[PDB]
Symmetry: C2
Subunit: 321 residues, 2 copies
């Protein structure tokens, strides 16, 4: 036995949005039903950044992703976020593969958006808003368009060029799109928030009846994108209650004591497994609060891995004797 | 920037017992002085084994060891315990290296025995007892003999052949040695227990005045090697208080409520750093309870890695874009 090693380039070509969506969907469901293992994240704090260990066990695979976040890195010429994933057999413990997880992380968060919209947005959804046109908004779009003939896109960003670049990308693939300011962008069927805002970027009365919001942006205590007033009158669905309470979109309203646990309707897993209701009336406004769960990562890695075996990809390394 | 990949064979030639001992010693000391980070181990439980994540941060590096334990493995033709280590820069988050840690683990456990004996045993120690002649006993020996002219070796094992094999190993190196039963083997200046016994292998009345004991064997709840009455009459020094209470040699005596926290004299780190006293009288019997700390692993990886850079060793992999 040897260990497979796969680089970012290799992984990219080894998994499609479609595969990723299935992996993620099934991962949420299995976890909701008690058929997946995900112990708490572990942190190592530094002055200039941090590292997290996120292990999980499901679908006959175990793995650990080890991912950093160092904001100063761009200015140093490296990416803000680098992730490696070690994938293991639960039978032997053997390290089947060590692979990049930078790409897959982005991929599965988008996948997750797609799935959540799949279960929570109105089926007749045609107009799509993007508040923030960074890397994740692309993934969110790519996944969402696996589930919707997206009729119009409305794109807002703080940086003029970033918005435009996003719009050009849409028009490249036939989606009619338009740069718009945040006011009008927020008015749609599906809204996708990806900003790392600390004040709310979206106002309550901009959100119409029947809107679904993928609140992906917020990634830590104090980050917030939506007016606490939308959360007050919405069907709220989480990635994971603890992690949403700490770092997700609800974190500030929870801390200020404006909504509590009581107010969260369901985990997405629960919705997929049918333990809790999805969307009810057309008029209601729904929010998916995304956080990232390690099970998403392992589930997507088993897909990459198994394909790599199929297509004979990677370097093989013999770690032991 | 690229990531260095090193296999077992490579790592083996990249660190000496000496270096390892220095790494481990300094690691204990730094940790006791509050100059190192080591969050609690993370576990992933399976029917047929487990995986553990061990991060640590010290000496200007961060790393994570990911190590399995699957007893059925020999029967399947694999090792019981495989560990990979990812070594990172705290400045950038960058994964400098991914290397075997199977061997380093064994190596640093021995080094730790050497260090603890260096601080806790009688300086005039000549006769050495080994209760258990498995691979760890070799490391324990090889480290121990960096700190003493080992006069005589006494080797017990439940398997006759393994005892002999260990004796032959010692005689090959000039150390005069003899297979003995456990009764007489336990009569010495330094006793090294490495068995995974669940009943006490050593009796209280066998252990003489001035003996030091490296209780390495016990690796989990219920494991034990020493007669609880040795512990009652001894200066007990630990790897790490928590992990000892859970899994180490004290774990059964603590659970049955025979000794408690108050009975533990010091952590080894504290003894190294001079926060607590080492050996006092000749007559007293001392016990080092070893459990294994992630800092030990990161500390030796730093050594391996920096040497690998010196000697231009390993494969270079570019994980990212």
């Amino acid at each position: 036995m040897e260990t497979l090693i796969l680089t970012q380039e290799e992984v990219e070509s080894l998994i499609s949005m479609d595969e990723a969506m299935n992996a993620v969907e099934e991962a949420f469901r299995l976890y909701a039903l008690g058929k997946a293992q995900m112990p708490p994240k572990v942190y190592l704090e530094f002055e200039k950044g941090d590292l997290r260990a996120m292990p999980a066990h499901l679908m006959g695979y175990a793995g650990l992703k080890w991912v950093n976040s160092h904001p100063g890195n761009p200015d140093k010429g490296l990416p803000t976020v680098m992730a490696l994933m070690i994938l293991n057999s639960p039978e032997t413990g053997f390290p089947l593969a060590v692979m990049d997880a930078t790409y897959t992380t982005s991929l599965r968060t988008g996948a997750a958006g797609g799935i959540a919209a799949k279960y929570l947005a109105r089926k007749n959804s045609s107009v799509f808003g993007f508040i923030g046109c960074g890397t994740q908004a692309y993934f969110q779009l790519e996944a969402l368009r696996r589930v919707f003939d997206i009729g119009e896109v409305k794109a807002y960003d703080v940086r003029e060029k970033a918005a435009k670049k996003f719009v050009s990308y849409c028009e490249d693939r036939g989606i009619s799109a338009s740069v718009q300011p945040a006011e009008e962008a927020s008015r749609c069927d599906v809204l996708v928030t990806t900003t790392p805002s600390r004040k709310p970027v979206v106002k309550a009365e901009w959100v119409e009846e029947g809107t679904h919001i993928n609140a992906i942006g917020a990634d830590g205590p104090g980050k917030q994108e939506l007016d606490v007033e939308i959360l007050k009158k919405a069907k709220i669905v989480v990635d994971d209650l603890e992690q949403a309470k700490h770092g997700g979109e609800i974190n500030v309203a929870v801390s200020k004591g404006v909504i509590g646990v009581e107010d969260v309707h369901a985990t997405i897993g629960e919705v997929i497994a049918g333990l809790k209701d999805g969307r009810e009336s057309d008029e209601e406004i729904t929010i998916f609060d995304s956080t990232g769960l390690a099970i998403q990562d392992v589930a997507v890695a088993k897909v990459v891995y198994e394909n790599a075996l199929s297509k004979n990809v990677g370097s093989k390394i013999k770690f032991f004797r």
